[PDB]
Amino acid sequence: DYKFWYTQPVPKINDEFNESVNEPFISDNKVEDVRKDEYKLPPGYSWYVCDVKDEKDRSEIYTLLTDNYVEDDDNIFRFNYSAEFLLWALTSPNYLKTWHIGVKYDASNKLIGFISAIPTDICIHKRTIKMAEVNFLCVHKTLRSKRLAPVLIKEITRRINLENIWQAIYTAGVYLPKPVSDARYYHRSINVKKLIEIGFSSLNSRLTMSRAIKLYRVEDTLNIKNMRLMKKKDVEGVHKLLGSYLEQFNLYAVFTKEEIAHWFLPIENVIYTYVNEENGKIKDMISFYSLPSQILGNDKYSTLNAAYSFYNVTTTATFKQLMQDAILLAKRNNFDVFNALEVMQNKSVFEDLKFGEGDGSLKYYLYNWKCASFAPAHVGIVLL
Numbered sequence: 001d002y003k004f005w006y007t008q009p010v011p012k013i014n015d016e017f018n019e020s021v022n023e024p025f026i027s028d029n030k031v032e033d034v035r036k037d038e039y040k041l042p043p044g045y046s047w048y049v050c051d052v053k054d055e056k057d058r059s060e061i062y063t064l065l066t067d068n069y070v071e072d073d074d075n076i077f078r079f080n081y082s083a084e085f086l087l088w089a090l091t092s093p094n095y096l097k098t099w100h101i102g103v104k105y106d107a108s109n110k111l112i113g114f115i116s117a118i119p120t121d122i123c124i125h126k127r128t129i130k131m132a133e134v135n136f137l138c139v140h141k142t143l144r145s146k147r148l149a150p151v152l153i154k155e156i157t158r159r160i161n162l163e164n165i166w167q168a169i170y171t172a173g174v175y176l177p178k179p180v181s182d183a184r185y186y187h188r189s190i191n192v193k194k195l196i197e198i199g200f201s202s203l204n205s206r207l208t209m210s211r212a213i214k215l216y217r218v219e220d221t222l223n224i225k226n227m228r229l230m231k232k233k234d235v236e237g238v239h240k241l242l243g244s245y246l247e248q249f250n251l252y253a254v255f256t257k258e259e260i261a262h263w264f265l266p267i268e269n270v271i272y273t274y275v276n277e278e279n280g281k282i283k284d285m286i287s288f289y290s291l292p293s294q295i296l297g298n299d300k301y302s303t304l305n306a307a308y309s310f311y312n313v314t315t316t317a318t319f320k321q322l323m324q325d326a327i328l329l330a331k332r333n334n335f336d337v338f339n340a341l342e343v344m345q346n347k348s349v350f351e352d353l354k355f356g357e358g359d360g361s362l363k364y365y366l367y368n369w370k371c372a373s374f375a376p377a378h379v380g381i382v383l384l
């Protein structure tokens with residue numbers, strides 16, 4: 001029925017727009033009209049402004065998400081974003097502490113809800129719009145289906161609107177009104193044996209355990225010999241390389257130099273970026289972020305370490321060679337699996353590089369924006 005979503009400036013289930021439509025559902029919005037009062041919570045609960053740069057407030061967010069965030073359909077896994085990753089993801093340039101919103105249960109003083117946004121310039125079908133990118137919406141498992149999520153959504157919407165921002169981008173594995181694109185995930189096994197032991201990958205009489213380990217074996221030698229961790233000096237070159245590349249897509253972020261530095265400069269166990277520098281210019285880049293999952297009730301293993309493909313550009317190699325080196329660099333860093341979405345040029349490399357098609361997909365959404373939907377090959381942005 002989408003009783004909450006149908007109240008919002010988003011497309012209906014049946015809405016389809018021509019390619020030339022590219023505009024807000026509701027235009028001419030005024031900051032002066034925005035409600036100044038916080039949305040009402042049920043009795044016994046209060047808004048809390050989280051300070052993500054405070055280790056202890058950050059750890060409270062970490063706990064909530066560790067225990068209560070997204071699980072796969074089969075409840076094998078729960079994502080387990082680290083505390084340091086949350087710091088990185090939430091404190092990009094011009095972030096607002098007031099857009100990192102908690103809800104506490106008063107009697108326990110415990111965080112039971114969260115939602116966040118950061119500001120980003122988003123180009124959709126050639127129009128660049130100031131938007132908020134929303135993530136980490138989470139209600140405690142003991143408090144589900146009580147309509148707390150719309151309260152979280154309406155309150156962050158209000159706080160964003162106070163900044164004269166009227167559009168947002170967000171992604172979800174669930175279907176909501178109405179995706180602008182949909183991309184499946186694909187997985188490249190690295191630690192084949194672990195993936196078999198936890199019930200994720202499957203063997204048969206043609207594919208015995210030794211055969212499966214050999215199938216996924218990689219040569220520890222880069223196609224691009226000088227690929228190396230990005231350093232502060234590389235910022236201008238990555239900004240040039242990436243920013244030019246992204247302009248071919250129908251949906252992408254428009255990064256400033258400050259944004260390049262924050263999003264790509266490497267941080268151990270969070271973000272890995274490698275570059276190939278020739279005569280002081282950056283000609284190729286690989287990047288992936290770390291996102292482990294908790295393995296739910298497995299006797300032997302508690303964590304699956306996973307790298308997620310981020311942005312990758314090649315000018316001196318084939319896209320296949322570049323991604324083969326991204327898998328190698330992920331293996332060198334102790335990742336169990338390398339995950340990517342069929343966005344940008346990715347789908348082309350998946351069969352040859354031994355990726356398997358996953359079980360679900362990630363839907364991309366705009367809030368208060370009307371445009372034609374598009375195939376994921378035309379998506380040029382990867383959210384966290």
Ligand SMILES: CCCCCCCCCCCCCC(=O)CSCCNC(=O)CCNC(=O)[C@H](O)C(C)(C)COP(=O)(O)OP(=O)(O)OC[C@H]1O[C@@H](n2cnc3c(N)ncnc32)[C@H](O)[C@@H]1OP(=O)(O)O
Nearest residue numbers: 002003004005135136137138139144145146147148149166
């Ligand atoms: C201009 C600024 C604009 C800013 C804001 C833009 C929009 C930002 C939107 C947020 C983007 C976040 C992106 C993001 O974080 C990445 S997607 C991951 C979201 N988090 C999880 O899945 C965590 C595990 N689950 C939970 O914590 C709860 O199940 C949540 C909190 C998901 C729902 O709590 P609950 O206790 O299960 O449910 P009620 O409180 O009873 O509420 C049910 C209503 O919630 C709608 N719902 C369910 N899942 C949703 C989802 N993933 N997006 C949006 N809406 C979602 C649902 O369709 C229904 O409305 P409907 O009746 O119309 O069908």
Ligand SMILES: CCCCc1c(C)nc2ccc(OC)cc2c1SCCC#N
Nearest residue numbers: 070071072077078079185187293337339
């Ligand atoms: C082994 C392939 C990775 C799949 C995976 C893992 C490890 N954890 C998840 C936790 C939550 C969840 O919510 C839908 C999905 C997963 C998945 S599949 C989607 C992410 C990817 N790739």
Ligand SMILES: [Cl-]
Nearest residue numbers: 007039150154
């Ligand atoms: Cl309301």
Ligand SMILES: [Mg+2]
Nearest residue numbers: 145146147148
């Ligand atoms: Mg609820």
